[PDB]
Short mmCIF file of all heavy atoms in Angstrom, two decimals:
data_model
loop_
_atom_site.label_atom_id
_atom_site.label_comp_id
_atom_site.label_asym_id
_atom_site.label_seq_id
_atom_site.Cartn_x
_atom_site.Cartn_y
_atom_site.Cartn_z
N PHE A 1 45.38 22.44 37.07
CA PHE A 1 45.42 23.84 36.67
C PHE A 1 44.11 24.57 36.90
O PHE A 1 43.04 23.95 36.92
CB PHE A 1 45.75 23.94 35.19
CG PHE A 1 47.21 23.67 34.88
CD1 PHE A 1 47.71 22.37 34.80
CD2 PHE A 1 48.07 24.74 34.64
CE1 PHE A 1 49.06 22.17 34.51
CE2 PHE A 1 49.40 24.50 34.34
CZ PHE A 1 49.88 23.28 34.29
N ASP A 2 44.22 25.86 37.12
CA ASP A 2 43.09 26.77 37.18
C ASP A 2 42.95 27.25 35.74
O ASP A 2 43.87 27.87 35.21
CB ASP A 2 43.42 27.96 38.08
CG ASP A 2 42.39 29.07 37.96
OD1 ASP A 2 41.21 28.75 38.19
OD2 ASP A 2 42.75 30.19 37.62
N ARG A 3 41.82 26.96 35.10
CA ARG A 3 41.66 27.33 33.68
C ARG A 3 41.67 28.82 33.38
O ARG A 3 42.22 29.25 32.38
CB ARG A 3 40.36 26.75 33.12
CG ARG A 3 40.39 25.27 33.01
CD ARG A 3 38.98 24.78 32.71
NE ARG A 3 38.91 23.32 32.63
CZ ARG A 3 39.22 22.62 31.55
NH1 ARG A 3 39.68 23.21 30.44
NH2 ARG A 3 39.09 21.30 31.59
N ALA A 4 41.09 29.61 34.26
CA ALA A 4 41.01 31.05 34.03
C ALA A 4 42.38 31.72 33.94
O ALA A 4 42.59 32.57 33.08
CB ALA A 4 40.17 31.73 35.13
N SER A 5 43.31 31.30 34.81
CA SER A 5 44.63 31.92 34.88
C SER A 5 45.66 31.16 34.09
O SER A 5 46.72 31.70 33.75
CB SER A 5 45.10 31.96 36.34
OG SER A 5 45.26 30.65 36.88
N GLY A 6 45.40 29.87 33.89
CA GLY A 6 46.31 28.99 33.21
C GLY A 6 47.46 28.59 34.13
O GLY A 6 48.48 28.10 33.66
N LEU A 7 47.30 28.78 35.44
CA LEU A 7 48.33 28.49 36.44
C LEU A 7 48.00 27.26 37.29
O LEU A 7 46.86 26.79 37.32
CB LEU A 7 48.55 29.71 37.33
CG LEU A 7 48.95 31.02 36.60
CD1 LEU A 7 49.13 32.13 37.60
CD2 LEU A 7 50.23 30.80 35.76
N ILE A 8 48.99 26.74 38.00
CA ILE A 8 48.80 25.57 38.85
C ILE A 8 48.02 25.93 40.11
O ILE A 8 48.33 26.91 40.76
CB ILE A 8 50.15 24.93 39.25
CG1 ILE A 8 50.88 24.46 37.98
CG2 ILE A 8 49.90 23.77 40.21
CD1 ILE A 8 52.34 24.10 38.17
N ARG A 9 47.02 25.12 40.45
CA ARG A 9 46.24 25.33 41.66
C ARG A 9 46.46 24.26 42.73
O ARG A 9 46.22 24.51 43.93
CB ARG A 9 44.75 25.42 41.36
CG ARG A 9 44.08 24.14 41.03
CD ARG A 9 42.60 24.37 40.70
NE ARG A 9 41.91 23.10 40.51
CZ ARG A 9 40.74 22.96 39.92
NH1 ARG A 9 40.09 24.04 39.45
NH2 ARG A 9 40.20 21.75 39.83
N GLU A 10 46.99 23.08 42.34
CA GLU A 10 47.19 22.01 43.30
C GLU A 10 48.19 21.01 42.76
O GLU A 10 48.19 20.74 41.58
CB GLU A 10 45.88 21.30 43.58
CG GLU A 10 45.97 20.20 44.61
CD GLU A 10 44.59 19.63 44.94
OE1 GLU A 10 43.76 20.36 45.56
OE2 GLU A 10 44.33 18.47 44.56
N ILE A 11 49.02 20.46 43.65
CA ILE A 11 49.94 19.38 43.32
C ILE A 11 49.79 18.33 44.42
O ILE A 11 49.67 18.68 45.60
CB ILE A 11 51.42 19.82 43.20
CG1 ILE A 11 51.56 20.98 42.20
CG2 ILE A 11 52.30 18.63 42.81
CD1 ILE A 11 52.99 21.55 42.04
N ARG A 12 49.67 17.07 44.02
CA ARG A 12 49.56 15.93 44.94
C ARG A 12 50.72 14.98 44.59
O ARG A 12 50.73 14.41 43.49
CB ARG A 12 48.21 15.21 44.81
CG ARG A 12 47.03 16.12 45.06
CD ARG A 12 45.72 15.37 45.08
NE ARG A 12 45.38 14.62 43.86
CZ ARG A 12 44.78 15.13 42.79
NH1 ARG A 12 44.59 16.44 42.67
NH2 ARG A 12 44.47 14.34 41.76
N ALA A 13 51.68 14.84 45.50
CA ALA A 13 52.89 14.05 45.26
C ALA A 13 52.87 12.69 45.98
O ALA A 13 52.39 12.53 47.12
CB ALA A 13 54.15 14.84 45.69
N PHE A 14 53.50 11.73 45.26
CA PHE A 14 53.63 10.32 45.64
C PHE A 14 55.08 9.90 45.45
O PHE A 14 55.78 10.48 44.61
CB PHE A 14 52.69 9.45 44.79
CG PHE A 14 51.26 9.92 44.85
CD1 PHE A 14 50.81 10.85 43.95
CD2 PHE A 14 50.37 9.45 45.79
CE1 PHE A 14 49.52 11.33 43.99
CE2 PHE A 14 49.06 9.92 45.84
CZ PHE A 14 48.63 10.84 44.93
N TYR A 15 55.54 8.92 46.21
CA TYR A 15 56.96 8.55 46.22
C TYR A 15 57.20 7.12 45.82
O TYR A 15 56.39 6.21 46.05
CB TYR A 15 57.51 8.68 47.63
CG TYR A 15 57.46 10.04 48.24
CD1 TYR A 15 57.53 10.19 49.62
CD2 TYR A 15 57.41 11.20 47.47
CE1 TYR A 15 57.53 11.46 50.20
CE2 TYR A 15 57.41 12.47 48.09
CZ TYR A 15 57.50 12.57 49.43
OH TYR A 15 57.49 13.84 50.02
N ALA A 16 58.38 6.89 45.26
CA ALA A 16 58.87 5.52 45.04
C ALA A 16 59.46 4.99 46.34
O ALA A 16 60.64 4.69 46.43
CB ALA A 16 59.94 5.47 43.88
N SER A 17 58.61 4.93 47.36
CA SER A 17 58.98 4.46 48.66
C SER A 17 58.01 3.34 49.05
O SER A 17 56.82 3.47 48.81
CB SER A 17 58.87 5.61 49.67
OG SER A 17 59.39 5.24 50.95
N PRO A 18 58.53 2.27 49.66
CA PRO A 18 57.66 1.15 50.01
C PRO A 18 56.61 1.52 51.08
O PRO A 18 56.77 2.48 51.80
CB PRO A 18 58.65 0.09 50.48
CG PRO A 18 59.78 0.79 50.99
CD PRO A 18 59.90 2.06 50.12
N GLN A 19 55.52 0.78 51.10
CA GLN A 19 54.47 0.95 52.09
C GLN A 19 55.08 0.87 53.46
O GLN A 19 55.77 -0.09 53.77
CB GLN A 19 53.49 -0.20 51.95
CG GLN A 19 52.82 -0.33 50.67
CD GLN A 19 51.91 -1.55 50.62
OE1 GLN A 19 51.33 -1.95 51.63
NE2 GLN A 19 51.75 -2.14 49.42
N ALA A 20 54.80 1.86 54.30
CA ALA A 20 55.33 1.89 55.68
C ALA A 20 54.62 0.82 56.48
O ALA A 20 53.40 0.71 56.43
CB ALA A 20 55.11 3.25 56.30
N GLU A 21 55.37 0.05 57.25
CA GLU A 21 54.76 -1.01 58.04
C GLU A 21 53.97 -0.43 59.20
O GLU A 21 54.31 0.61 59.77
CB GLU A 21 55.84 -2.00 58.52
CG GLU A 21 56.36 -2.91 57.37
N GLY A 22 52.86 -1.10 59.50
CA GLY A 22 52.03 -0.76 60.65
C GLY A 22 51.18 0.49 60.56
O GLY A 22 50.70 0.99 61.59
N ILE A 23 51.02 1.03 59.35
CA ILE A 23 50.24 2.22 59.14
C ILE A 23 48.96 1.81 58.40
O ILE A 23 49.01 1.28 57.30
CB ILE A 23 51.00 3.25 58.30
CG1 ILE A 23 52.35 3.63 58.96
CG2 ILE A 23 50.13 4.48 58.08
CD1 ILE A 23 52.18 4.22 60.31
N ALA A 24 47.81 2.08 59.00
CA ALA A 24 46.55 1.61 58.43
C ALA A 24 46.14 2.36 57.17
O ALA A 24 45.53 1.76 56.28
CB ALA A 24 45.43 1.73 59.48
N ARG A 25 46.42 3.65 57.11
CA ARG A 25 46.01 4.48 55.99
C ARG A 25 47.23 5.22 55.43
O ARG A 25 47.78 6.10 56.08
CB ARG A 25 44.89 5.48 56.39
CG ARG A 25 43.68 4.87 57.08
CD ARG A 25 42.50 5.87 57.20
NE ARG A 25 42.01 6.32 55.90
CZ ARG A 25 41.04 5.76 55.17
NH1 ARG A 25 40.34 4.71 55.61
NH2 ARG A 25 40.77 6.29 53.97
N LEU A 26 47.64 4.84 54.25
CA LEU A 26 48.77 5.47 53.59
C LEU A 26 48.18 6.35 52.51
O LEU A 26 47.79 5.85 51.45
CB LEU A 26 49.71 4.40 53.04
CG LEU A 26 50.55 3.70 54.12
CD1 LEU A 26 51.23 2.46 53.57
CD2 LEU A 26 51.57 4.62 54.78
N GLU A 27 48.06 7.64 52.76
CA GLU A 27 47.39 8.56 51.87
C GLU A 27 48.01 9.93 52.06
O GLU A 27 48.90 10.11 52.89
CB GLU A 27 45.86 8.55 52.13
CG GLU A 27 45.44 8.85 53.57
CD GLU A 27 44.00 8.55 53.84
OE1 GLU A 27 43.27 8.01 53.01
OE2 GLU A 27 43.53 8.87 54.95
N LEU A 28 47.57 10.90 51.28
CA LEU A 28 48.14 12.24 51.39
C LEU A 28 47.77 12.92 52.72
O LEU A 28 46.65 12.83 53.18
CB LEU A 28 47.64 13.11 50.25
CG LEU A 28 47.99 12.64 48.84
CD1 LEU A 28 47.12 13.36 47.84
CD2 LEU A 28 49.46 12.82 48.58
N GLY A 29 48.74 13.60 53.31
CA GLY A 29 48.51 14.34 54.53
C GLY A 29 47.68 15.59 54.29
O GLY A 29 47.86 16.30 53.29
#
């Protein structure tokens, strides 16, 4: 949250999905 406005400033989402094979870095795009 942004404290001044009391509103959302960022969301970072993650999934109940298994690690993709052959991908060196599994992180947010």
